Amino acid sequence: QESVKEFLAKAKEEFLKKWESPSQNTAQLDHFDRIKTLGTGSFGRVMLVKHKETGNHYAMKILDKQKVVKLKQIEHTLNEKRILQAVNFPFLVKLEFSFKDNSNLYMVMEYVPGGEMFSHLRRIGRFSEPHARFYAAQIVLTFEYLHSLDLIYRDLKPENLLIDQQGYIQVTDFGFAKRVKGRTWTLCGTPEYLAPEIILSKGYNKAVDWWALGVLIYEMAAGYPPFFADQPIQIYEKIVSGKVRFPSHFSSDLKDLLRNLLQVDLTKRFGNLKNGVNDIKNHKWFATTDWIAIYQRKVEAPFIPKFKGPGDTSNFDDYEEEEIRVSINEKCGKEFTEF
Template sequence: MQALKERISSKLSEKTKSKDKEGSSSLKNSSPIDGKHSTTHDLHHHHHQTTSSSSSAVAGNIAGINVQSAEKVKAFLAKAKDEFQVKYDRPSQNTARPEDFDRIRTLGTGSFGRVMLVKHQASGNFYAMKILDKQKVVKLKQIEHTLNEKRILQAISFPFLVNLEYHFKDNSYLYMVLEFVPGGEMFSHLRKVGRFSEQHARFYAAQIVLTFEYLHYLDILYRDLKPENLLIDAEGYLKVTDFGFAKKIKGKTILKKETRKTFENKRL
C-alpha cells in the first residue's frame, strides 16, 4: 500500500520537482558579477550552459527512476496474476456462519438484497455484510452476475479494491462480508461540494488508473465505474466496490451486443 501511495505522489509531483531542481541548480552554479570582466552576454551564456547541464542531469535521473519503477510494477503484476489465478480456479467455500456476526444497522438496500453493518463476535471488527435473497437473485436472472462477483472478489487483492473477508450461504440467503469503508460513497461527497478541485481529481484519477491497470492485467472487465461505486476510506483513499457487472475474459474479447446495450442503458 505504501509503495502505491508513493507512486501516486511521485506521479502528481514529478513536473514540480523537475522545475524546482532546474531552478535551484542554476542559482547554485551561477557566477557572481566580477566587475569589468563580467558582461551581460557572459552571464546569459553561463546561465544557459548551467541550466542545460542541470536539466540533462534531472532528465537522466527521472528516466532511471522510471525504468526501475516500471520493472517493479511489472514484477508486482506478474506475481499478482499468479496468485489471482490460483484462487480463481479454486474458489473457497463457506468461511464463516451467519451467527458469527452481530447485525447493527442497514447501510443500504438493493433489488435483491441489502447491506448491513455487522460486528464480528470473535475479533470485534466491523464489516459490511451483503445479504442476497436467493429467490430474488433467481427471479431477476442475476445468478451469473452474483457468482462472478463472489468468485472475483475472493481472488483479487489490491489496496484500492474492497476486500472480501468472509463468504457463506444458508437455505435462503447468500452472504458476502466485505471490509467496512467509513467514508461513504464519492457520489455523496461530490454532491455536497459540486465538483472536486483539479488536485483532488488527479489524486483520485491516479488511484483509479492503478486499480484498472491491475484488473486489466488479470483480464477482468469491471464495467460499472461511477461515483456511487467509489468509497472513501478513513485516510482519504479510494476503494472500488460492487463487482456485480465484472467479468473475467479470455484473451482478446470483443464487446457483445448485450454489453454495449448495458452501457447505453446506463447512460440513459
C-alpha cells in the same frame, strides 16, 4: 519498465491460484450481531454487523437466492464472489468471509466508514482539478491491475468509490465484473456511464472501462455528467453522438485527455491503443502525479472524512429495517452449488 512488468506477472500468478481453487463456507450468520442497514437494492442489501467473539465491524452483503434467479443474475452473482475471493490490491474493498444458507448468499466485506464519493461531491458541488486527479490516478492503477488479470469491471460510478480513514479510494460492488479474454455482450451498467458500443448491442471489451473513467473525471471536475438528460433514451442519443461541451473553467490539458477517453470509435480510444495504459499515465494532465507514491499511500490526501470510530454510520443514510429470514426448506440449491 521491468519493475512494473514483474509486479503484474506476480499479481496474475497469485490471482490464478485462488481463481482455480476458490474458498467456500468460511463463517455463519449467528457469528454476527446485526446493527444497521447501510444500503438496499433489487435483490439484496448491505448491513453493518459486529463479529460476536472479536468485536470487529464488517459490511455484510445479503442476496436473496429466489430473487437472483427471477432477475436472471445467477452468473453475475457467481462471478462477483469468485473474483473477490481471488483479487488483492490497495484500492479494492477486501472480502473477509463468504457463506450461504437455505434462503440467502452472504459476502462479508471490510467496512469503510467515510461514505460514498458521491455524497461528498454533491455536498461541496465540484472538486478542484488536483483533487479530481488524486482520485483518478487511483482508478488508473486499479484498472491497470484488473485488466492485466483479463477482468472487466463494468460498474464505474461515484456511488461505488468509498473514502477511507486516510482519504484514499476503495472500489466496491463487483456484481457486473467478469473474466473476459476477448469480447462479451451483456447489457449492464448505469445509463450515464455506458459506452456507445454497449448502447448499440455490440461485442465489447475492456475499452468500456476507459470510457467510464472519462465520464467520472468530467463529473468530478464539473459537478454533473457530460451526457446529462431527463430520460434514458435522451441520454443514449447524446452518448452515441459523442458531442461533448466543456465548462470554460476546465484546463486545456483536461479537455484534451477527456476528448481521447470519450472517443466514440473504440479503436481510437486512450487505454485501447498500442501503448495501452501508458498513453494515459504519460498525458500532460498527469504530469505532477507520482504513480509509485500513490500506490504506496505516501501522498497526503485532499481531505479526511469526519467520523467518530470504526462503528460510526453518520456518513450513510436511513433505510427501513427489514428481517433476515431463513426458510426451513432449501431454495435453489442446484443453481448455487459452487458458491
